[PDB]
């Protein structure tokens with residue numbers, strides 16, 4: 001009922017990060033005003049969900065500014081991680097149907113935003129639990145990197161919306 005949406009910025013080579021998990025390619029390229037505005041998307045979200053890698057990247061890179069304080073956060077790991085005792089975060093593991101249902105509830109009928117990364121998104125997809133994708137594409141190939149959706153087997157999707165920006169950047173919504 002509440003949808004698992006994977007909202008993610010990707011290279012033409014289908015990488016969400018460079019091999020050393022950097023993101024210059026994106027932060028160094030101006031998107032343009034014509035781009036669907038972040039708040040318009042976030043407003044449709046009452047739950048974020050992610051992996052151990054993406055989390056450590058927000059904490060190391062933005063320590064005193066969590067970006068999802070509005071909403072409950074799920075960080076996937078099989079480790080013994082803790083977060084700042086003020087922040088709204090719950091560490092889960094194992095199967096993804098169970099995680100999904102937990103995540104959907106906490107969304108309170110708004111959508112669950114799979115922030116990433118690939119490994120994690122792949123995990124949900126592998127379980128048929130991932131529903132739609134929102135890829136902003138940057139006009140560049142980095143050659144090697146963090147796979148956007150490393151599924152075990154081929155995932156058929158259905159283009160639903162597609163914009164091209166004046167910047168050469170590109171946005172598209174796809175349904176599983």
Ligand SMILES: NC(=O)C1=CN([C@@H]2O[C@H](COP(=O)(O)OP(=O)(O)OC[C@H]3O[C@@H](n4cnc5c(N)ncnc54)[C@H](OP(=O)(O)O)[C@@H]3O)[C@@H](O)[C@H]2O)C=CC1
Nearest residue numbers: 009016017051052053054077078093094116117118119120
């Ligand atoms: N817009 C964008 O382009 C975005 C880019 N990124 C980039 O992506 C990078 C990380 O992506 P990526 O490395 O592919 O993967 P993830 O961020 O998903 O992290 C992977 C880790 O998630 C844990 N995990 C995943 N699924 C499960 C499960 N079912 N049960 C238990 N643990 C689980 C494991 O950690 P453990 O060791 O703890 O078991 C696994 O190693 C970030 O570093 C960032 O650079 C990230 C988000 C958005």
